PDB file of all heavy atoms in Angstrom:
ATOM      1  N   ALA B  36     121.798 107.597 124.667  1.00 60.20           N
ATOM      2  CA  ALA B  36     120.406 107.344 125.004  1.00 60.20           C
ATOM      3  C   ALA B  36     120.220 105.893 125.420  1.00 60.20           C
ATOM      4  O   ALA B  36     120.805 104.987 124.821  1.00 60.20           O
ATOM      5  CB  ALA B  36     119.489 107.663 123.823  1.00 60.20           C
ATOM      6  N   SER B  37     119.400 105.678 126.447  1.00 57.15           N
ATOM      7  CA  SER B  37     119.145 104.333 126.955  1.00 57.15           C
ATOM      8  C   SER B  37     117.800 104.337 127.666  1.00 57.15           C
ATOM      9  O   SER B  37     117.658 104.976 128.711  1.00 57.15           O
ATOM     10  CB  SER B  37     120.255 103.884 127.896  1.00 57.15           C
ATOM     11  OG  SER B  37     120.183 104.585 129.124  1.00 57.15           O
ATOM     12  N   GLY B  38     116.825 103.622 127.111  1.00 57.19           N
ATOM     13  CA  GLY B  38     115.520 103.526 127.732  1.00 57.19           C
ATOM     14  C   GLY B  38     114.364 103.626 126.761  1.00 57.19           C
ATOM     15  O   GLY B  38     113.202 103.538 127.164  1.00 57.19           O
ATOM     16  N   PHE B  39     114.666 103.804 125.478  1.00 55.34           N
ATOM     17  CA  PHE B  39     113.631 103.936 124.463  1.00 55.34           C
ATOM     18  C   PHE B  39     114.215 103.542 123.115  1.00 55.34           C
ATOM     19  O   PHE B  39     115.413 103.288 122.984  1.00 55.34           O
ATOM     20  CB  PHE B  39     113.052 105.356 124.432  1.00 55.34           C
ATOM     21  CG  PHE B  39     114.051 106.423 124.066  1.00 55.34           C
ATOM     22  CD1 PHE B  39     114.114 106.918 122.778  1.00 55.34           C
ATOM     23  CD2 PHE B  39     114.909 106.945 125.016  1.00 55.34           C
ATOM     24  CE1 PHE B  39     115.020 107.899 122.442  1.00 55.34           C
ATOM     25  CE2 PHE B  39     115.816 107.926 124.682  1.00 55.34           C
ATOM     26  CZ  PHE B  39     115.871 108.403 123.395  1.00 55.34           C
ATOM     27  N   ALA B  40     113.342 103.483 122.112  1.00 51.41           N
ATOM     28  CA  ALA B  40     113.724 103.096 120.755  1.00 51.41           C
ATOM     29  C   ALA B  40     114.436 104.266 120.092  1.00 51.41           C
ATOM     30  O   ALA B  40     113.828 105.082 119.401  1.00 51.41           O
ATOM     31  CB  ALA B  40     112.501 102.665 119.956  1.00 51.41           C
ATOM     32  N   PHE B  41     115.755 104.335 120.290  1.00 53.61           N
ATOM     33  CA  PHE B  41     116.535 105.463 119.789  1.00 53.61           C
ATOM     34  C   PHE B  41     116.470 105.577 118.272  1.00 53.61           C
ATOM     35  O   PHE B  41     116.685 106.661 117.723  1.00 53.61           O
ATOM     36  CB  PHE B  41     117.988 105.330 120.245  1.00 53.61           C
ATOM     37  CG  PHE B  41     118.893 106.414 119.732  1.00 53.61           C
ATOM     38  CD1 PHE B  41     118.927 107.652 120.343  1.00 53.61           C
ATOM     39  CD2 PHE B  41     119.710 106.192 118.639  1.00 53.61           C
ATOM     40  CE1 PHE B  41     119.757 108.645 119.874  1.00 53.61           C
ATOM     41  CE2 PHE B  41     120.540 107.183 118.167  1.00 53.61           C
ATOM     42  CZ  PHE B  41     120.564 108.410 118.785  1.00 53.61           C
ATOM     43  N   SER B  42     116.174 104.484 117.581  1.00 53.29           N
ATOM     44  CA  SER B  42     116.228 104.459 116.128  1.00 53.29           C
ATOM     45  C   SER B  42     114.966 105.003 115.471  1.00 53.29           C
ATOM     46  O   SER B  42     114.914 105.075 114.239  1.00 53.29           O
ATOM     47  CB  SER B  42     116.490 103.033 115.643  1.00 53.29           C
ATOM     48  OG  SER B  42     116.584 102.988 114.232  1.00 53.29           O
ATOM     49  N   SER B  43     113.954 105.386 116.250  1.00 50.35           N
ATOM     50  CA  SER B  43     112.710 105.904 115.696  1.00 50.35           C
ATOM     51  C   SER B  43     112.504 107.383 115.995  1.00 50.35           C
ATOM     52  O   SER B  43     111.444 107.924 115.668  1.00 50.35           O
ATOM     53  CB  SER B  43     111.517 105.102 116.222  1.00 50.35           C
ATOM     54  OG  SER B  43     111.332 103.915 115.474  1.00 50.35           O
ATOM     55  N   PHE B  44     113.487 108.051 116.590  1.00 47.63           N
ATOM     56  CA  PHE B  44     113.358 109.429 117.037  1.00 47.63           C
ATOM     57  C   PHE B  44     114.362 110.302 116.300  1.00 47.63           C
ATOM     58  O   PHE B  44     115.539 109.946 116.196  1.00 47.63           O
ATOM     59  CB  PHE B  44     113.601 109.535 118.545  1.00 47.63           C
ATOM     60  CG  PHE B  44     112.456 109.057 119.384  1.00 47.63           C
ATOM     61  CD1 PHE B  44     112.462 107.787 119.923  1.00 47.63           C
ATOM     62  CD2 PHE B  44     111.377 109.877 119.642  1.00 47.63           C
ATOM     63  CE1 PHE B  44     111.415 107.342 120.694  1.00 47.63           C
ATOM     64  CE2 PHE B  44     110.328 109.436 120.414  1.00 47.63           C
ATOM     65  CZ  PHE B  44     110.349 108.166 120.940  1.00 47.63           C
ATOM     66  N   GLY B  45     113.901 111.441 115.791  1.00 46.71           N
ATOM     67  CA  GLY B  45     114.820 112.478 115.380  1.00 46.71           C
ATOM     68  C   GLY B  45     115.431 113.178 116.577  1.00 46.71           C
ATOM     69  O   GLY B  45     114.886 113.171 117.677  1.00 46.71           O
ATOM     70  N   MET B  46     116.590 113.792 116.364  1.00 46.64           N
ATOM     71  CA  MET B  46     117.328 114.416 117.454  1.00 46.64           C
ATOM     72  C   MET B  46     117.700 115.846 117.095  1.00 46.64           C
ATOM     73  O   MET B  46     117.876 116.176 115.920  1.00 46.64           O
ATOM     74  CB  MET B  46     118.590 113.624 117.799  1.00 46.64           C
ATOM     75  CG  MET B  46     118.341 112.164 118.117  1.00 46.64           C
ATOM     76  SD  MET B  46     117.253 111.912 119.529  1.00 46.64           S
ATOM     77  CE  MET B  46     118.361 112.272 120.884  1.00 46.64           C
ATOM     78  N   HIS B  47     117.816 116.688 118.116  1.00 47.48           N
ATOM     79  CA  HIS B  47     118.181 118.088 117.977  1.00 47.48           C
ATOM     80  C   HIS B  47     119.306 118.421 118.947  1.00 47.48           C
ATOM     81  O   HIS B  47     119.577 117.687 119.898  1.00 47.48           O
ATOM     82  CB  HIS B  47     116.982 119.007 118.245  1.00 47.48           C
ATOM     83  CG  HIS B  47     115.857 118.852 117.271  1.00 47.48           C
ATOM     84  ND1 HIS B  47     115.450 119.870 116.437  1.00 47.48           N
ATOM     85  CD2 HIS B  47     115.039 117.807 117.012  1.00 47.48           C
ATOM     86  CE1 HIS B  47     114.439 119.455 115.698  1.00 47.48           C
ATOM     87  NE2 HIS B  47     114.169 118.206 116.028  1.00 47.48           N
ATOM     88  N   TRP B  48     119.970 119.545 118.691  1.00 43.28           N
ATOM     89  CA  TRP B  48     120.897 120.152 119.637  1.00 43.28           C
ATOM     90  C   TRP B  48     120.451 121.585 119.870  1.00 43.28           C
ATOM     91  O   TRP B  48     120.247 122.333 118.911  1.00 43.28           O
ATOM     92  CB  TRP B  48     122.339 120.126 119.124  1.00 43.28           C
ATOM     93  CG  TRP B  48     123.041 118.812 119.282  1.00 43.28           C
ATOM     94  CD1 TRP B  48     123.184 117.843 118.336  1.00 43.28           C
ATOM     95  CD2 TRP B  48     123.713 118.332 120.451  1.00 43.28           C
ATOM     96  NE1 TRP B  48     123.895 116.786 118.845  1.00 43.28           N
ATOM     97  CE2 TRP B  48     124.230 117.062 120.144  1.00 43.28           C
ATOM     98  CE3 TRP B  48     123.921 118.851 121.730  1.00 43.28           C
ATOM     99  CZ2 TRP B  48     124.943 116.305 121.065  1.00 43.28           C
ATOM    100  CZ3 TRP B  48     124.628 118.095 122.644  1.00 43.28           C
ATOM    101  CH2 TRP B  48     125.130 116.838 122.307  1.00 43.28           C
TER     102      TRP B  48
END
Side-chain angles (χ1 to χ4, degrees):
Chain B
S37 72
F39 63 99
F41 178 80
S42 182
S43 277
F44 284 98
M46 305 300 284
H47 296 243
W48 281 97

